[PDB]
């Protein structure tokens, strides 16, 4: 199917700072990936983003009733919807599951990669640090970065490239909003 | 900012496909099944805590459809440029033999929001227990999509997520097999 496609897309964003103390509402209209007109509650009128959107900015700005609908949106829409979903979105907390397993940068050589798997957690913000015998190791650390699983959970792999010596104890340390004390997992050579 | 809630909607011709959804910090709260004209909560429990009038979504889609006709004329029937997706296959958690897990196929950074996705087990299409999301918004106005496949890890089975998109010349396969 090589028929041309034509896509009409619109979003309305509610941005929250300090709970609902400060709120910004942004309505956006797009055609084929080009944003052409928007309403920003900082301004309180529509503005053309491209020339193709100018007729609508002018047209919608001439409708005072529509404008006042949008000017109130931070209250009637943003703050309202925030409250509706607060208990299972804003207040959603799922503890990370932490495991450590050894791996290799090179298959023919010995295990030289300690993987700290941190998974199933919510929200997204996470901090993972590696320690060797109680001393933080900042060198040789590589990660997947934050992985979104698309299902209100996240994960990450944080890997330490190191040559384990007998008797060494490695510790993976995880900080996350669900805990007020770091989670730790030890791995021994 | 602390949080962002996004309502995202589109209508696409000539496919006549439309979607309406709410996003919280990158996750889907719900979308509206256009066929059944019903709210579909991303996690089942959400529906016990909140509700939504799907007719409001249907009304917006009709507007989107009208706005599409207007814009297509204004732009002199300029077609959308295909942007092919990036595809990543991963598991829900570290893999252990004979321990139930889930394969995730993450389809990212593409437009238009139309894709064919097939899970392959040893080269064979599999549909048992599979699930998927609708098209999720991005800050750059391209789209995201997730497909899922529960599975029992083994040494004999290999998997691929096969993705077809008009921006791709051939289907894109991303592989997974047991890490040894």
């Amino acid at each position: 199917d090589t028929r041309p496609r034509f896509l009409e897309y619109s979003t309305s964003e509610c941005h929250f700072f300090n709970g609902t103390e400060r709120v910004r509402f942004l309505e956006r209209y797009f055609h084929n990936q080009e944003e052409n007109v928007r309403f920003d509650s900082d301004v309180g009128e529509y503005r053309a983003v491209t020339e193709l959107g100018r007729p609508d900015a002018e047209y919608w700005n001439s409708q005072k009733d529509l404008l006042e609908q949008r000017r109130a949106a931070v209250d009637t829409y943003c703050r309202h919807n925030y409250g509706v979903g607060e208990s299972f979105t804003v207040q959603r907390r799922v503890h990370p599951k932490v495991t450590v397993y050894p791996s290799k940068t090179q298959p023919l050589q010995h295990h030289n990669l300690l993987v700290c798997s941190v998974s199933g957690f919510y929200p997204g913000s996470i901090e993972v640090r590696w320690f060797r015998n109680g001393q933080e190791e900042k060198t040789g650390v590589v990660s997947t970065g934050l992985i979104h699983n698309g299902d209100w959970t996240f994960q990450t792999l944080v890997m330490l490239e190191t040559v384990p010596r007998s008797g060494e104890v490695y510790t993976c340390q995880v900080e996350h909003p669900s805990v007020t004390s770091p989670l730790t997992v030890e791995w021994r050579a | 900012e602390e949080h962002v809630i996004i309502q995202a909607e589109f209508y696409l011709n000539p496919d006549q496909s439309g979607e309406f959804m709410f996003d919280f910090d990158g996750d889907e709260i719900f979308h509206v099944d256009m066929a059944k004209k019903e709210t579909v909560w991303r996690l089942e429990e959400f529906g016990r805590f909140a509700s939504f009038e799907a007719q409001g979504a249907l009304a917006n889609i009709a507007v989107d459809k009208a706005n599409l006709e207007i814009m297509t004329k204004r732009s002199n029937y300029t077609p959308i440029t295909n942007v092919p997706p990036e595809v990543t296959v991963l598991t829900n958690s570290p893999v252990e033999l004979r321990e139930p897990n889930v394969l995730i196929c993450f389809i990212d950074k593409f437009t238009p929001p139309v894709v064919n996705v097939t899970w392959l087990r040893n080269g064979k299409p599999v549909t048992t227990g599979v699930s998927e999301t609708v098209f999720l918004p991005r800050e750059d106005h391209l789209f995201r999509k997730f497909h899922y496949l529960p599975f029992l890890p083994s040494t004999e089975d290999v998997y691929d997520c096969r993705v077809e998109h008009w921006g791709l010349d051939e289907p894109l396969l991303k592989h997974w097999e047991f890490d040894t």
Partner: peptide, 13 residues
């Protein structure tokens, strides 16, 4: 509670 819809408007014809 009930989620509120931002009702989109029709462009200029």
């Amino acid at each position: 509670g009930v989620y509120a819809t931002r009702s989109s408007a029709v462009r200029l014809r």
